[PDB]
C-alpha cells in the first residue's frame, strides 16, 4: 500500500524513477539497475494511456504478487513508482524461464532439476489456492522462472482467479478446478523431461485439443532412466478424468515431492553451467 520505495532483502530504500538506470528491454518490461545499491531488477512499465485489457491483467497480477510476500516460490515485488503518466512495478530479476531454458538446452532437463522445480511450483500453486483462493489457469514452462542462485519461482498471474497446448481435458470438454492446473504441470514436466512437446506435429490449436481428448495421456518414457517416483508423479498429474486427478494436498504427499524436499540439489551450479553453453 506504499509507493516510491524499494524493499530488497529486508532493507527499505527511498527511491524515485530517476534512481534507476535502464539497461534494456527484456506491457513493457525493463532490466534496470538501482543506482543506490547496484541491485539489478526487472521493472514493468504500465503506461497510463496503455491498453485497458493489458493494464487490467497487469494490475491483477500485481495484486496477487503483493499478497504473496510470504511465499518463497512466487516472484516477488520490491515496490512501485506512480507518476502522472506511468506505473513502474519493480520485480525481482530471474535468470530465465523454463521454456527458454529448454531451447537453450536443446535437450532434456535432468530429473533432479525437475524435482526441485516440481516442489517449488506445486507449493506455489498450493499457496495461491489455500491462502488467496486463486487458481493460476495458465501453468506452462514460460511461467516457471529460475535464477543463478538456484531459486525456482512461479511468475505473474494475469488470468489468476489459458494456453491451448496445456489445457486439461475438462477445460476442453467441460462436464458442467485447481486440478486443471495439475494437468498443465504434468504436460510441462513431460515436455521439459523429454525436450519435446508431447502432442507433436500439430498445426492448429484445435488439433492439439483433439489429441488431448482422443489420445492416451502422454506419460514419461520408460527408457530415459526416469525414477519410478517421477513416472508415478507424472502419471497422476496426467489422469484424464479430473474427478480422479489428485488435488495439491495429495500431490504434496507424493514420494517424488518428498524426495526433493530434503535432497540437496545444486540447481545454482547446474544453471550457470547451462547458460555458459550459450
Ligand atoms: C527469459 C526471462 C528472463 C527473466 C524473466 C523474469 N525475471 N523476473 C521476472 C518478473 C516477472 C516476470 C518475468 C521475470 C523472465 C523470463 O522469461
Author numbering: 117 to 142, 148 to 282, 295 to 309, 316 to 417
Verbatim from the authors:
Our results suggested that installing an aldehyde at the para position of the phenyl ring and replacing the acrylamide warhead with a hydroxyl group will allow the ligand to bind Lys221 of MKK7 covalently (ligand RMSD = 1.3 Å and ring RMSD = 0.7 Å, respectively). To validate this prediction, we synthesized 1, incubated it with MKK7 (Overnight, 4 °C) and measured its binding via intact protein LC/MS. As the aldehyde warhead is expected to form a reversible covalent imine bond with the lysine amine, the mixture was reduced with NaBH4 (5 mM; 1 h; Room temp.) to trap the covalent complex prior to LC/MS measurements. Significant labeling was detected only after the reduction of the complex, which correlates with the reversible nature of the imine bond. Compounds 1 and 4 showed IC50 values of 738 nM and 695 nM, respectively, compared to 1.1 μM for Staurosporine. Compound 1 was confirmed to covalently bind to Lys221 using X-ray crystallography. The crystal structure confirmed Lys221 as the binding site, despite poor electron density at the covalent linkage, it showed a large movement of the lysine side-chain, which is pointing away from the ligand in the original cysteine-bound structure, indicating the formation of the covalent bond. Elevated b-factors and the electron density map indicate flexibility and/or lower occupancy of the ligand, additionally this partial occupancy might be the result of the reversible nature of the imine covalent bond, and reflect partial hydrolysis of the bond. Comparison of this structure with the predictions from both of our protocols showed close agreement to the obtained structure, with some minor differences, such as our ligand-side protocol placing the hydroxyl group at the opposite side of the ring, resulting in a slightly higher RMSD value of 1.8 Å (0.5 Å without the hydroxyl), and our protein-side protocol showing a slight rotation of the phenyl ring. However, no experimental density was observed for the hydroxyl, hence our prediction might still be accurate.
Covalent binding to lysine involves challenges such as the increased pK a of the side chain and its considerable flexibility. Here, we describe two computational methods to derivatize lysine-binding covalent small-molecules based on known noncovalent binders, approaching the design problem from two opposite directions. We prospectively validated these protocols by designing and testing a new lysine-targeting MKK7 inhibitor.
